[PDB]
Amino acid sequence: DSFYIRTHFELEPSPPSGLGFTRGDVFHVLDTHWLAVRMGRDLREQERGIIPNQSRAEQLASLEAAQRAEDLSALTRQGRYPPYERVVLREASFKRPVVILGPVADIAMQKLTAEMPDQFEIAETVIIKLDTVRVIAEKDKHALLDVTPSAIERLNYVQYYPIVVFFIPESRPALKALRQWLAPASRRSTRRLYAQAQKLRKHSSHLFTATIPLNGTSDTWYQELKAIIREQQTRPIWTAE
DSSP: OOEEEEEOSOBOOOSSSBOOBOTTOEEEEEEOOEEEEEEOTTOOEEEEEEEOOHHHHHHHHHHHHHHOOOOOHHHHHHHTOOSEEEEEEEEOSSOOOEEEESTTHHHHHHHHHHHOTTTEEEOOOOOOOHHHHHHHHHTTOEEEEOOOHHHHHHHHHTTOOOEEEEEEESOHHHHHHHHHHHSTTOOOOHHHHHHHHHHHHHHHGGGOSEEEEEOSSSTHHHHHHHHHHHHHTTSEEEEEO
Protein backbone atom coordinates (compact mmCIF):
# COMPACT_ATOMS: atom_id res chain seq x y z
CA ASP A 1 0.00 0.00 0.00
CA SER A 2 0.94 3.68 -0.28
CA PHE A 3 -0.26 6.81 1.50
CA TYR A 4 0.77 9.69 3.74
CA ILE A 5 1.07 9.35 7.49
CA ARG A 6 1.34 11.80 10.37
CA THR A 7 3.17 10.64 13.51
CA HIS A 8 1.80 11.31 17.01
CA PHE A 9 4.58 9.92 19.17
CA GLU A 10 8.35 10.36 19.44
CA LEU A 11 10.90 7.93 17.98
CA GLU A 12 14.70 8.06 17.89
CA PRO A 13 16.66 7.49 14.67
CA SER A 14 18.06 4.00 14.11
CA PRO A 15 21.04 2.87 11.98
CA PRO A 16 21.13 2.58 9.17
CA SER A 17 17.67 2.91 7.60
CA GLY A 18 15.32 3.52 10.55
CA LEU A 19 13.95 7.07 10.58
CA GLY A 20 13.32 9.17 13.66
CA PHE A 21 10.24 11.33 14.09
CA THR A 22 8.35 13.75 16.29
CA ARG A 23 4.69 14.54 16.89
CA GLY A 24 3.55 16.19 13.66
CA ASP A 25 6.07 14.81 11.18
CA VAL A 26 4.63 13.49 7.93
CA PHE A 27 5.76 10.51 5.89
CA HIS A 28 5.07 9.46 2.35
CA VAL A 29 4.92 5.72 2.98
CA LEU A 30 6.12 4.27 -0.32
CA ASP A 31 5.34 0.62 0.38
CA THR A 32 4.03 -1.61 3.17
CA HIS A 33 8.62 -2.43 8.34
CA TRP A 34 7.21 0.31 6.09
CA LEU A 35 9.39 1.98 3.48
CA ALA A 36 8.81 5.71 3.94
CA VAL A 37 10.15 9.15 3.03
CA ARG A 38 10.07 12.28 5.18
CA MET A 39 8.16 15.34 4.00
CA GLY A 40 9.57 18.79 4.72
CA ARG A 41 7.73 22.13 4.83
CA ASP A 42 8.69 22.17 1.14
CA LEU A 43 6.35 19.22 0.57
CA ARG A 44 9.42 17.78 -1.15
CA GLU A 45 10.66 14.28 -0.28
CA GLN A 46 13.70 14.20 2.00
CA GLU A 47 15.43 11.39 3.93
CA ARG A 48 14.41 7.93 2.71
CA GLY A 49 14.30 5.03 5.17
CA ILE A 50 12.34 2.62 7.36
CA ILE A 51 9.55 3.25 9.88
CA PRO A 52 7.48 0.99 12.20
CA ASN A 53 4.26 -0.50 10.89
CA GLN A 54 0.85 0.35 12.34
CA SER A 55 1.01 -2.44 14.90
CA ARG A 56 4.54 -1.81 16.17
CA ALA A 57 3.70 1.90 16.11
CA GLU A 58 0.71 1.44 18.41
CA GLN A 59 2.88 -0.47 20.90
CA LEU A 60 5.63 2.15 20.81
CA ALA A 61 2.98 4.76 21.61
CA SER A 62 1.32 2.86 24.47
CA LEU A 63 4.84 2.40 25.76
CA GLU A 64 5.67 6.11 25.59
CA ALA A 65 2.44 6.83 27.43
CA ALA A 66 3.35 4.52 30.31
CA GLN A 67 6.81 6.09 30.37
CA ARG A 68 4.89 9.17 31.47
CA ALA A 69 4.43 8.26 35.15
CA GLU A 70 8.10 22.05 22.72
CA ASP A 71 6.19 19.08 24.17
CA LEU A 72 2.91 18.58 22.29
CA SER A 73 1.67 15.51 24.19
CA ALA A 74 -1.21 17.32 25.89
CA LEU A 75 -2.60 18.23 22.47
CA THR A 76 -2.34 14.64 21.19
CA ARG A 77 -4.60 13.65 24.06
CA GLN A 78 -6.96 16.62 23.83
CA GLY A 79 -7.07 15.94 20.07
CA ARG A 80 -7.49 12.16 20.38
CA TYR A 81 -4.96 11.60 17.60
CA PRO A 82 -3.82 7.99 16.97
CA PRO A 83 -0.12 7.02 16.82
CA TYR A 84 -0.46 7.04 13.03
CA GLU A 85 -2.88 9.37 11.27
CA ARG A 86 -3.45 8.92 7.55
CA VAL A 87 -3.44 12.37 5.94
CA VAL A 88 -4.12 13.83 2.49
CA LEU A 89 -3.39 17.20 0.84
CA ARG A 90 -6.19 19.72 0.31
CA GLU A 91 -6.54 23.47 -0.12
CA ALA A 92 -7.63 24.99 3.19
CA SER A 93 -11.39 25.36 3.48
CA PHE A 94 -10.72 28.29 5.77
CA LYS A 95 -8.55 31.40 5.82
CA ARG A 96 -5.23 30.36 7.36
CA PRO A 97 -3.84 32.27 10.34
CA VAL A 98 -0.87 34.44 9.42
CA VAL A 99 2.17 34.72 11.68
CA ILE A 100 4.41 37.74 11.13
CA LEU A 101 7.89 37.32 12.59
CA GLY A 102 10.67 39.89 12.48
CA PRO A 103 11.07 43.51 13.55
CA VAL A 104 7.93 44.82 11.82
CA ALA A 105 5.20 42.46 12.96
CA ASP A 106 3.42 45.42 14.57
CA ILE A 107 3.73 47.68 11.52
CA ALA A 108 2.78 44.89 9.12
CA MET A 109 -0.30 43.88 11.13
CA GLN A 110 -1.61 47.44 11.50
CA LYS A 111 -1.26 48.21 7.80
CA LEU A 112 -3.06 44.98 6.85
CA THR A 113 -6.14 45.51 8.99
CA ALA A 114 -6.20 49.23 8.24
CA GLU A 115 -6.16 48.60 4.51
CA MET A 116 -8.41 45.53 4.55
CA PRO A 117 -10.60 45.26 7.69
CA ASP A 118 -12.73 42.65 5.91
CA GLN A 119 -9.94 40.12 5.43
CA PHE A 120 -7.75 40.65 8.47
CA GLU A 121 -8.12 40.99 12.22
CA ILE A 122 -5.37 41.06 14.81
CA ALA A 123 -5.67 38.15 17.25
CA GLU A 124 -5.86 39.66 20.75
CA THR A 125 -3.23 38.35 23.21
CA VAL A 126 -2.72 39.10 26.92
CA ILE A 127 -0.68 34.05 26.34
CA ILE A 128 -2.61 33.17 23.18
CA LYS A 129 -5.73 30.99 22.95
CA LEU A 130 -6.73 28.83 20.01
CA ASP A 131 -10.39 29.92 20.35
CA THR A 132 -9.29 33.46 19.63
CA VAL A 133 -7.93 32.33 16.27
CA ARG A 134 -10.92 30.08 15.57
CA VAL A 135 -13.40 32.91 16.17
CA ILE A 136 -11.56 35.13 13.64
CA ALA A 137 -11.33 32.42 10.99
CA GLU A 138 -15.10 31.95 11.38
CA LYS A 139 -15.62 35.57 10.25
CA ASP A 140 -13.79 34.43 7.11
CA LYS A 141 -10.71 36.52 7.90
CA HIS A 142 -7.00 35.85 8.32
CA ALA A 143 -6.09 35.98 12.00
CA LEU A 144 -2.85 37.95 12.30
CA LEU A 145 -0.49 36.58 14.97
CA ASP A 146 2.59 37.92 16.72
CA VAL A 147 3.80 34.83 18.54
CA THR A 148 6.68 32.59 19.54
CA PRO A 149 8.11 29.58 17.68
CA SER A 150 6.40 27.45 20.34
CA ALA A 151 3.00 28.93 19.51
CA ILE A 152 3.69 28.18 15.84
CA GLU A 153 4.41 24.49 16.50
CA ARG A 154 1.10 24.11 18.33
CA LEU A 155 -0.84 25.70 15.45
CA ASN A 156 0.97 23.49 12.98
CA TYR A 157 0.07 20.52 15.18
CA VAL A 158 -3.68 21.17 15.32
CA GLN A 159 -3.45 21.77 11.57
CA TYR A 160 -4.29 25.47 11.44
CA TYR A 161 -0.96 25.66 9.59
CA PRO A 162 -0.29 29.40 9.79
CA ILE A 163 1.42 31.21 6.97
CA VAL A 164 4.69 32.19 8.65
CA VAL A 165 6.56 35.20 7.27
CA PHE A 166 9.93 36.37 8.57
CA PHE A 167 11.38 39.80 7.75
CA ILE A 168 15.15 40.13 7.47
CA PRO A 169 16.70 43.48 8.53
CA GLU A 170 19.70 44.88 6.67
CA SER A 171 21.21 46.50 9.75
CA ARG A 172 20.40 48.13 13.09
CA PRO A 173 20.58 51.59 11.51
CA ALA A 174 18.55 50.52 8.45
CA LEU A 175 15.90 49.12 10.79
CA LYS A 176 15.82 52.21 13.01
CA ALA A 177 15.29 54.29 9.88
CA LEU A 178 12.48 52.07 8.62
CA ARG A 179 10.76 52.10 12.01
CA GLN A 180 11.08 55.86 12.50
CA TRP A 181 9.42 56.33 9.10
CA LEU A 182 6.60 53.76 9.45
CA ALA A 183 6.15 53.80 13.24
CA PRO A 184 7.16 57.38 14.15
CA ALA A 185 5.58 57.40 17.61
CA SER A 186 6.69 53.85 18.43
CA ARG A 187 8.72 53.44 21.61
CA ARG A 188 10.54 50.13 21.14
CA SER A 189 14.19 49.06 21.01
CA THR A 190 15.55 48.98 17.49
CA ARG A 191 18.18 47.08 19.44
CA ARG A 192 16.08 44.43 21.20
CA LEU A 193 14.18 43.89 17.94
CA TYR A 194 17.24 43.41 15.73
CA ALA A 195 18.80 40.85 18.07
CA GLN A 196 15.43 39.07 18.33
CA ALA A 197 15.31 38.64 14.55
CA GLN A 198 18.85 37.25 14.64
CA LYS A 199 17.77 34.74 17.29
CA LEU A 200 14.73 33.67 15.25
CA ARG A 201 16.76 33.26 12.05
CA LYS A 202 19.46 31.24 13.81
CA HIS A 203 17.24 28.70 15.55
CA SER A 204 13.75 28.97 14.02
CA SER A 205 14.35 29.03 10.23
CA HIS A 206 12.65 25.65 9.91
CA LEU A 207 9.27 27.15 10.84
CA PHE A 208 9.27 29.86 8.15
CA THR A 209 7.04 29.51 5.10
CA ALA A 210 8.50 32.73 3.69
CA THR A 211 11.26 35.25 4.30
CA ILE A 212 11.28 38.80 2.94
CA PRO A 213 14.27 41.17 2.87
CA LEU A 214 13.74 44.58 4.44
CA ASN A 215 15.78 46.62 1.97
CA GLY A 216 14.85 50.26 2.50
CA THR A 217 11.84 52.40 3.38
CA SER A 218 9.64 51.72 0.35
CA ASP A 219 6.41 49.70 0.23
CA THR A 220 8.15 46.78 -1.48
CA TRP A 221 8.35 44.33 1.46
CA TYR A 222 4.71 45.12 2.24
CA GLN A 223 3.75 44.43 -1.38
CA GLU A 224 5.55 41.08 -1.46
CA LEU A 225 3.93 40.34 1.89
CA LYS A 226 0.39 40.79 0.57
CA ALA A 227 1.13 38.68 -2.51
CA ILE A 228 2.65 35.92 -0.39
CA ILE A 229 -0.41 35.67 1.86
CA ARG A 230 -2.87 35.41 -1.04
CA GLU A 231 -0.64 32.86 -2.77
CA GLN A 232 0.14 30.47 0.06
CA GLN A 233 -3.56 30.61 0.95
CA THR A 234 -4.21 28.55 -2.19
CA ARG A 235 -1.45 26.02 -1.43
CA PRO A 236 -2.69 22.58 -0.26
CA ILE A 237 -2.14 21.71 3.40
CA TRP A 238 -2.19 18.39 5.27
CA THR A 239 -5.57 17.23 6.54
CA ALA A 240 -7.08 14.04 7.98
CA GLU A 241 -7.95 11.42 5.35
